[PDB]
């Protein structure tokens, strides 16, 4: 932890987000919400379509050294 910290009674495990009122924190957690089921493994790319992700895999992560064949 580079940046100092006051010492809030509650904090977020996902990010360095902390609040005074517990209930408040929970509300913040919402920030880590997602509507698109299909998510990428390489990057944080999420699409509400099965094809959008497929083509995206190669679109960006296509000319990469993944499989040990070729
Ligand atoms: Zn957070
Ligand atoms: Zn990706």
The domain that holds 11 is classified in CATH as: 3.30.160.60
70 within some domain: no
Q: How many domains does the chain have?
A: 2
19 within some domain: yes
Residues whose CB is under 5 A from ligand 2 (ion)? 40, 42-43, 45
69 within some domain: no
54 alpha carbon – ligand 1 mean position (Å): 29
Distance CA 65, CA 69 (A): 9
Method: NMR
SS3 11: strand
Contact 39, 45 (CB under 8 A): yes
If you compute the radius of gyration of the chain from its CA atoms, what whole number of angstroms results?
18
53 alpha carbon – ligand 1 mean position (Å): 26
Burial classification of residue 24, based on how many CB atoms lie within 10 Å of its CB (0-12 exposed, 13-18 middle, 19 or more buried): exposed
Contact 45, 56 (CB under 8 A): yes
2 within some domain: no
Residue 39 lies in domain: 35-63
27 within some domain: yes
38 alpha carbon – ligand 1 mean position (Å): 21
46 alpha carbon – ligand 2 mean position (Å): 8
Give, for 18, the enclosing helix (H) or strand (E). Answer: strand 18-19
Same domain, 55 and 42: yes
């Amino acid at each position: 932890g580079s940046s100092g910290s006051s010492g809030h009674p509650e904090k977020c495990s996902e990010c360095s987000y902390s609040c005074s009122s517990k209930a408040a924190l929970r509300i913040h957690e919402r920030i880590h919400c997602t509507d698109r089921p299909f998510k990428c493994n390489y990057c944080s790319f999420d699409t509400k379509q099965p094809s959008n992700l497929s083509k995206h895999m190669k679109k960006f992560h296509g000319d990469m050294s993944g499989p040990s064949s070729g």
